């Protein structure tokens, strides 16, 4: 599923991401735009053999299991395929553990390089929340 911008903001809002660990809703919408282009089915293979999954491109190196990342971890206790569903619950639950891990939203490289320090409120402007 390819979400709309305001549609995804509403979904993230009701799942409790607004101001979660201090990060306003606009930071989460901006990250998803540049990580996945709002597509829940996005995947990308990394040079070390891990794979990034779903709307926030969660990495199998640490957070989910796909059976093909030798020596990896499954800290979210979830199959990586569950992060590709049209319902964002699984990604949001795993995202909350990721952001609390110590580096904050810097864990998302596209957030640090394209959203951090910008006017992120413009991503939720005009949305029925
Ligand atoms: C901080 N990392 C996610 C890289 C490892 C956690 O043990
Ligand atoms: C922030 N953008 C202008 C790129 C999206 C519309 O709000
Ligand atoms: Cl899709
Ligand atoms: Cl929308
Ligand atoms: Cl609900
Ligand atoms: Cl904030
Ligand atoms: Cl915001
Ligand atoms: Cl994701
Ligand atoms: Cl293994
Ligand atoms: Cl584990
Ligand atoms: Cl699994
Ligand atoms: Cl949803
Ligand atoms: Cl932080
Ligand atoms: Cl990470
Ligand atoms: Cl507004
Ligand atoms: Na957009
Ligand atoms: Na990425
Ligand atoms: Na893994
Ligand atoms: Na395996
Ligand atoms: Na700013």
From Swiss-Prot:
GO molecular function: beta-N-acetylglucosaminidase activity; identical protein binding; lysozyme activity
InterPro entries in alphabetical order: Glyco_hydro_22, Glyco_hydro_22_CS, Glyco_hydro_22_lys, Lysozyme-like_dom_sf
Domain (C-type lysozyme): residue spans on this chain: 1-129
An annotated GO BP: cell wall macromolecule catabolic process
Cell compartment(s), UniProt: Secreted
Annotated EC: 3.2.1.17
Major localization class: secreted
One Gene Ontology cellular component: endoplasmic reticulum
SUPFAM superfamilies: Lysozyme-like
Record field: catalytic activity: Hydrolysis of (1->4)-beta-linkages between N-acetylmuramic acid and N-acetyl-D-glucosamine residues in a peptidoglycan and between N-acetyl-D-glucosamine residues in chitodextrins
Tissues showing expression: In the egg white and polymorphonuclear leukocytes.
Enzyme active site: 35, 52
Annotated function: Lysozymes have primarily a bacteriolytic function; those in tissues and body fluids are associated with the monocyte-macrophage system and enhance the activity of immunoagents. Has bacteriolytic activity against M.luteus.
Family assignment from sequence similarity: Belongs to the glycosyl hydrolase 22 family.
Miscellaneous comment as given in the Swiss-Prot or TrEMBL entry: Lysozyme C is capable of both hydrolysis and transglycosylation; it also shows a slight esterase activity. It acts rapidly on both peptide-substituted and unsubstituted peptidoglycan, and slowly on chitin oligosaccharides.
Protein name per UniProt: Lysozyme C
Organism: Gallus gallus (Chicken)
Annotated gene: LYZ
């Amino acid at each position: 599923k390819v979400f709309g911008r305001c549609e995804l903001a509403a979904a993230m809002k009701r799942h409790g991401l607004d101001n979660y660990r201090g990060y306003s809703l606009g930071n989460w919408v901006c990250a998803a735009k540049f990580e996945s282009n709002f597509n829940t089915q996005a995947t990308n293979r990394n040079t070390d053999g891990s794979t990034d999954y779903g709307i926030l491109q969660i990495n199998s190196r640490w957070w989910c299991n796909d059976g093909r990342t030798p020596g990896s971890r499954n800290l979210c206790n979830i199959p990586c395929s569950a992060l590709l569903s049209s319902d964002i619950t699984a990604s949001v639950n795993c995202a909350k553990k990721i952001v609390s891990d110590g580096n904050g939203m810097n864990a998302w490289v596209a957030w640090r390089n394209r959203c951090k320090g910008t006017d992120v409120q413009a991503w939720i402007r005009g949305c029925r929340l």
